[PDB]
Amino acid sequence: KNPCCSHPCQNRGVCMSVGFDQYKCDCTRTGFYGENCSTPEFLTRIKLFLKPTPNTVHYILTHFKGFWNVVNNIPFLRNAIMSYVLTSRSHLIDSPPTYNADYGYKSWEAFSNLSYYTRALPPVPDDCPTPLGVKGKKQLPDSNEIVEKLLLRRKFIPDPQGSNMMFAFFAQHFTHQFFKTDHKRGPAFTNGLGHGVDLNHIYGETLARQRKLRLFKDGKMKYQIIDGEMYPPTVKDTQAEMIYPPQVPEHLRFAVGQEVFGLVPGLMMYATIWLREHNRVCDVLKQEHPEWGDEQLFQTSRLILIGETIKIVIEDYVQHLSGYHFKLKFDPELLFNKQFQYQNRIAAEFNTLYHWHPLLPDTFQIHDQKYNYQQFIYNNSILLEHGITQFVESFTRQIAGRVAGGRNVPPAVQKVSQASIDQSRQMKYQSFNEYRKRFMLKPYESFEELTGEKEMSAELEALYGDIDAVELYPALLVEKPRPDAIFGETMVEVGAPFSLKGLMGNVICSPAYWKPSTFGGEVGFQIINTASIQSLICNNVKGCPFTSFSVP
Amino acid sequence: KNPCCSHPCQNRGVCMSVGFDQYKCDCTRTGFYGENCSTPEFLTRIKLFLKPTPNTVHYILTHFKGFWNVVNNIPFLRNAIMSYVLTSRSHLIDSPPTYNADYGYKSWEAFSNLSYYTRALPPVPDDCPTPLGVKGKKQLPDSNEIVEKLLLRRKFIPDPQGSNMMFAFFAQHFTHQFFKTDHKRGPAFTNGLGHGVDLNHIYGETLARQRKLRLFKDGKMKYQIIDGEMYPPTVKDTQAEMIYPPQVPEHLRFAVGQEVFGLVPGLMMYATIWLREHNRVCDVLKQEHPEWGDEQLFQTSRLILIGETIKIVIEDYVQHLSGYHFKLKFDPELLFNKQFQYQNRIAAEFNTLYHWHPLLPDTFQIHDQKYNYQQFIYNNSILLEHGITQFVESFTRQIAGRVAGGRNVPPAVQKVSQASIDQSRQMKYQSFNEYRKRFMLKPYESFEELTGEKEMSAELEALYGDIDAVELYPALLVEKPRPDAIFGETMVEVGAPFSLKGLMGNVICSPAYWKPSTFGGEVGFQIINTASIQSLICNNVKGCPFTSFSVP
Numbered sequence A, B: 001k002n003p004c005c006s007h008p009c010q011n012r013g014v015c016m017s018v019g020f021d022q023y024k025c026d027c028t029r030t031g032f033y034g035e036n037c038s039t040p041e042f043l044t045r046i047k048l049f050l051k052p053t054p055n056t057v058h059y060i061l062t063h064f065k066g067f068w069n070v071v072n073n074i075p076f077l078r079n080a081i082m083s084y085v086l087t088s089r090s091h092l093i094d095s096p097p098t099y100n101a102d103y104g105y106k107s108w109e110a111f112s113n114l115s116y117y118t119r120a121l122p123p124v125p126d127d128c129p130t131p132l133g134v135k136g137k138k139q140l141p142d143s144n145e146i147v148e149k150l151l152l153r154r155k156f157i158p159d160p161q162g163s164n165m166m167f168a169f170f171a172q173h174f175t176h177q178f179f180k181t182d183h184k185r186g187p188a189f190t191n192g193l194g195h196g197v198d199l200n201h202i203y204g205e206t207l208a209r210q211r212k213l214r215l216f217k218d219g220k221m222k223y224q225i226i227d228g229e230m231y232p233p234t235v236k237d238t239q240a241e242m243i244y245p246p247q248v249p250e251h252l253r254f255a256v257g258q259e260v261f262g263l264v265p266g267l268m269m270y271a272t273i274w275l276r277e278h279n280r281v282c283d284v285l286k287q288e289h290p291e292w293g294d295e296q297l298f299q300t301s302r303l304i305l306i307g308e309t310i311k312i313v314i315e316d317y318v319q320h321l322s323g324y325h326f327k328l329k330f331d332p333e334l335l336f337n338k339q340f341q342y343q344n345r346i347a348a349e350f351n352t353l354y355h356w357h358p359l360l361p362d363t364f365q366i367h368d369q370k371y372n373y374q375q376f377i378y379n380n381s382i383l384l385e386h387g388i389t390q391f392v393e394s395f396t397r398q399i400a401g402r403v404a405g406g407r408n409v410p411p412a413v414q415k416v417s418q419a420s421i422d423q424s425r426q427m428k429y430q431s432f433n434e435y436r437k438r439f440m441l442k443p444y445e446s447f448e449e450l451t452g453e454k455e456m457s458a459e460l461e462a463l464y465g466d467i468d469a470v471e472l473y474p475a476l477l478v479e480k481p482r483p484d485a486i487f488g489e490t491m492v493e494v495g496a497p498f499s500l501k502g503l504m505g506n507v508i509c510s511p512a513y514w515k516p517s518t519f520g521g522e523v524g525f526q527i528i529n530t531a532s533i534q535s536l537i538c539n540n541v542k543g544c545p546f547t548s549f550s551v552p
Ligand code: COH
Pocket: A168, A169, A171, A172, A175, A179, A180, A181, A182, A260, A264, A351, A354, A355, A356, A357, A359, A360, A377, A413, A416
């Protein structure tokens, strides 16, 4: 019986066993002291007393529109506030990384082996009184029963923030470059060895695959013209492997950076758009540098698209999610006078937290047509029939589902929801409340406090028994949403540090990289700093249709 | 005719071609402006006028012994001084890394591909008038003529700092965990994907190899008992690949972390010593943690040995090399309030700089025996015959050769010296003076100034014709040595930044790692804080013989 099974060390203290039945807490630089690191120093009490709650800060950022309008248009003020948002978030992240699924203590194996997802909290020891430590019952509830009673959609619940399918598929497309679970190996392992925004889902994970996708003229990527429009090349032509069922004919097997993007037309849509953007940038650079060769044109274009991606994700994507009247800003210079590590390791909990299944609709609405899940998946024929323009117009206006609030997961992906729970247990995640404490949030003291409701909280009580036994994934989906919001508190407060760290931690944001020469001059640099979700569609989609991450 | 062939940009500005006929210098954050980044800004002019020369600083640090004795014993001042030497040196290194042999511009391939050595200076462009850019003759002088006329040892020149064989072999053993050139692939590539002090030369580069070397009992590494003492296991026993010529019998084919360490008995000596130290620490930790399993004992011991290594390298190895009266200090906490990147990429020029062939003696004296290179190389029988105790006593008393000053490379390793020159040209190194400017040193204006002597300078002038045409590796070895020192100015001013950055950049120095719990408690921390070259030998060599990096 491991002495640290009770997770006795508080406030990010480190538990270490000293003997078979005793433990010791390392309170170094926690701001606390005592046996469990639970007694605050003088300075710590003052900081705590003066620290406003996340909900308070959230209220201020989502109100006083007249105030933020002025702040947004004064760089001095906007920079100082954005600088605060960045610094205070990333400090909750261990960098360089620490634990993974196989190590609850610091080890060189955990640090050096990039095949693992890292871990924000160490795994629960193998031999503990309960699966989660000491709290709860000897056996966790049946994972399918959790999904059915708490997560399954009885009736479609639209997102009150108005997120659309353009947002939903952007989210899936973007995150699947660093969420690349090596399932044949196990949920603890990833294929994304770059561990961040490298755009491997466009260019490929290895040089061998990249060379299959490249045209080797003017720095461009291979493509084909169908009905006058640019689309990805075929598998037969590139010999770049893709995941396709037998029923998909050869001429419809599109080859892109990510092997699984043929699964759903929504992904292939963004894959096509980003492909168009790369070759567009190549033309721009070739005009600016007629002396450059194919290789430098390719490499510089890739760096620019990485910049565009981070720019769009912060100022459009995260901006939409936050609901802030304050306008977030992508500016690496904000950190040049701060302590910050330019590196990133993808955490398993970050992956799990991003299982935003409830976003998915009951049917997919393209033009005047509707498709069920069986018709939609692996169906590139739909994409060619309607075209990218029609796809953009339809997805922009189709609303997505609310993620928090419970019971909004489509039955079509019921087994996927269960898988998230099963894998979480396989990797021995700690409880939901342990993760709330890990990110300096007060733990919930009752099921009713979690959901803000009596029905689902009663079912939670019947299943888990104790609030400290509730698991991470289901609790995130049943958590009381913030007022008219898509998420609950925990989703934001745990997710934002991971998100922002991986964005600003990118190498191109470092002082040695963030300069005009890196991107082929001011022309390439400007492409990055003026990028938006609207400009991406306008530049690469016929007719330049209106688009947004929110419904009109 | 690349317009950047002349390397027009000064002070670490970035050169970029604009059209076929012109270039543009990016002076971002160089502290300079103008077309070539040559004109200093206001504060820059001030800092220049208030900053002394490295030779002036070196004088101060090597004199006023009574003064430094006072300084060394007042922690607050000693910490401030040591903090400054860490931050100022590491600032000259690009981190995250930039260029490599294949990329003279920033690219994702250069950043992400760990198989390359990184580069402090970008390679000379392919289409330049001269091999070095625009300076010098169209063809570089014969590499063998350079070795013969300038580098080959006539009479043995001993190190005036009194470095011994314990020092020479420690340097080779220590640096060959990150200097691991993949010669079958090219000099531009490395097998040390950890790019630093991971002690892979003990434990192996991969997990597969590590498992072959581990005992899986009490966290220990496999070993055998010969004549009552601990030695590495064999290849036959472990099935771990080693590089050995056919004439080496099976029982003399020892298996260690680094595949080439069977090449020299001096390397196998330190391999044996560090092996013993691992198993020693395992015994200490097991006494402290009876509840721990094999895996935790192994991993914790490895972290401790990494700590010991960095401690010894700073406070004994670099301390001896420097010749300073100021006492250097290994203390990660010195950087906790500073801007510092906890990562490292091994530079090709750092490798070339560390080719300290002149250290090698004419013969290897062990007890009453003398061995030439034919008798010594790949001869592990010598190690077993004398034992580690006799090895330590002999090598402690045998003096090493002077590195700078020219004409001190043993003819036995003549081709190695030629290979260093050939590989540098193959990797398209820039000139010696370009690298001086890269590390804020003034360029030599004449051969006579470089050598401080009329003989070899005349030979240099005949070979190269231009001082700006002299290559990095030959100039390092012929440079005028500092008064009674082993090195010249450039070796120290270029070498120290790379060296210190790789040491303090280590992850165990990071705030999240530098705490007692990481090393198994206070006992693990004390092992590190009490580490020395003396204690390393005393703890693991029979009889506890005295040792040092200098001749008694
Ligand atoms: C963030 C938004 C998001 C969306 C909109 C979305 C939309 C959809 C969708 C739309 C038609 C379908 C059929 C599915 C179905 C799946 N999802 Co998602 N998923 C999303 C987030 C994720 C994440 C994150 C994972 C884990 C990936 C991993 O570990 O490789 C995931 C995994 C899966 C898997 C497991 C295999 C795999 O994808 O590698 C299936 C199947 N799914 N999901």
